[model samples]
Target: GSSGSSGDNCREVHLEKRRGEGLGVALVESGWGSLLPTAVIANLLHGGPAERSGALSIGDRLTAINGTSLVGLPLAACQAAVRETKSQTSVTLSIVHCPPV
Candidate 1:
């Protein structure tokens, strides 16, 4: 994680917030915030424990939370699923931030 003094977990990127700095992570940007708020974003930035297990890159996208497929769930649902996971446990994302597009 980056050692930013403010520790807000947010930074300026073209006038909008893009997740990085603290962890050199790439965040998924969407218009919704209800289910993809702070803590949920944090998990995405942290690269989940699964990332450590797999052979992958830093800016991977977590496509899923727990076993729930995140292909089309609402933003709030995504947050709910991720938040439901215990703090001690890690959330998994079907990450591929760069592979797509």
Candidate 2:
């Protein structure tokens, strides 16, 4: 039995940050020089803002942050984008879910 390919598992996650707190998530560059090059969630800090939000997971493709697109950006730029959010009160992360292998 063959089924059609179903796309679109993207979602937006809103995270609230407290003063002097970190997002608790680590990012890594993925798909460089290929289609859909972007950053992916490589780690989650236990009990951190990102984990507490319960909306993020390792391997999730990060598409945007606070409405700023991360696609096609270099690893350093992506890291900078996240670092910039440290001063903000809230952050909206757009991600594409990566299914278990």
Candidate 3:
């Protein structure tokens, strides 16, 4: 029998971006005033790469970008991590599912 007390419900999603186009996703800090700081999907551009991927949600907590862990990163650093991958053709995002308000 499994003895783990906590379950990890996380998934990895790969999104592709075309040259000169943005990933079409916005990120913002969530879990404020309660849980530890974490970045969550804020918005998705209509018909954009993120939206087209159909794997992201507005409240999904982003745990990592590419291979860099977003845990314990400030908002600015989190955003920077995402921006650093702009030039890449594809970006892999690790996220935890959460209910959106």
Candidate 4:
């Protein structure tokens, strides 16, 4: 796939979350972290992978991980996928930091 970056209010952000970067991709984990019904980004912790990428923000949508679709998938599944694919390496994300209201 194509590789690129963007500024604020972007529709998509492609970033790599490396192993042990403390990437805190907090989704709207209301139903719980295991279910993670909606892949809406609740926040991006300081010093996290998002910070390394340097363009993410709270409320972004996580569309994919490692080129695999995450939308509508269980949060745990995505997390597991990240760990499995990114074992001692990095995992790419297809994110959308959304527009201003």
lDDT of each residue in 1-101, candidate 1, tens digit only? 96667433222111112232122223344543455422123333334343344433443334565456664555566555544554423444444333334
Q: Candidate 2: where are CA atoms >4 Å away?
A: 1-9, 98-101
Q: Of the candidates shown, which would achieve the greatest lDDT relative to the real structure?
A: 2
1 against 2, candidate with superior lDDT = 2
Number of colliding residue pairs in each model: 10, 0, 0, 0
Displacement of the residue 52 alpha carbon in candidate 1, Å:
8.1
Model 3, residue 70: distance off in Å is 0.5
Q: What is the C-alpha RMSD of each candidate to the true structure, in Å?
A: 15.5, 5.3, 3.7, 6.4
Please provide, for model 2 over 14-92, each residue's C-alpha lDDT reduced to its tens digit, 9 standing for 90 to 100.
9889865776779987765466577888898989767887778787788888899778888788888888888787888
Worst 10 residues of 4 by lDDT: 7-16
- Give the alpha carbon lDDT tens digit for every residue of 1-101 in model 3: 97655676667888888765677778987766455788878887878777787778677788888888888788788888788667787888888865566
How well does candidate 1 match the true structure in TM-score terms?
Answer: 0.38
Q: Candidate 2 at residue 17, lDDT?
A: 91
* TM-score to native of every candidate shown: 0.38, 0.79, 0.78, 0.58
Tens digits of per-residue lDDT for model 4, 1-101: 76555653324445556555555666654343454465666766777655567666675566776577776777776666655643435556666554567
**Residue 46 accuracy (lDDT) in model 1:** 34
Give the poorly placed runs of model 4, Cα more than 4 Å off.
1-12, 16-19, 29-37, 85-88, 97-101
Q: List the candidate numbers ranked by lDDT, top first.
A: 2, 3, 4, 1
